């Protein structure tokens, strides 16, 4: 159904936005994460993102509000496409090792170059050494 592990994984996504670990996501915290991924929302964009998910209207997102939104969403091409474009920041249609390292570091992941290459090899159906959109979706799917 909605499993204890799936909840746990959503809590992990919540923790990425809740940088100070205080239990709520603010507009400032959201802006931080989005900018760290090379995105650039406006004050107004960030506030409406908060407004959408903040069900009790106190101005911030707690984990039950985040879980509600995330479990609903789980029930998808456009989200996966946005995810791909976050990695593929030069828009050339291929995720390079450098692009992967870029996202990894901003996610708080810490993988060796050998692990980054392992990641690419596992996904790399056409053998070009980079991950195209097709291959990215396949790895995700």
């Amino acid at each position: 159904q909605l499993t204890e592990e799936q909840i746990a994984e959503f809590k992990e996504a919540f923790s990425l936005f809740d940088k100070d670990g205080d239990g709520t996501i603010t507009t400032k915290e959201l802006g931080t994460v989005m900018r760290s991924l090379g995105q650039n929302p406006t004050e107004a964009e960030l506030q409406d993102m908060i407004n959408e998910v903040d069900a009790d209207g106190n101005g911030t997102i707690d984990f039950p509000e985040f879980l509600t939104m995330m479990a609903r969403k789980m029930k998808s091409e456009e989200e996966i496409r946005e995810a791909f474009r976050v990695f593929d920041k030069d828009g050339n249609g291929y995720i390079s090792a450098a692009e992967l390292r870029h996202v990894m570091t901003n996610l708080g992941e810490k993988l060796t170059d050998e692990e980054v290459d392992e990641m690419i090899r596992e996904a790399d159906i056409d053998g070009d050494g980079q991950v195209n959109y097709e291959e990215f979706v396949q790895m995700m799917t």
């Binding site: 990425l16 936005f17 993102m49 985040f66 995330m70 969403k73 995810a83 990695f87 996610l107 596992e122």
Partner: peptide
Amino acid sequence: EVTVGKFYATFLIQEYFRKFKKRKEQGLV
């Protein structure tokens, strides 16, 4: 909302990494 899609996209980005790490641990890469 595509508004909520930005949150989910990040979960997906993190999911991309977590799936890999699990495979490498359990010897299923």
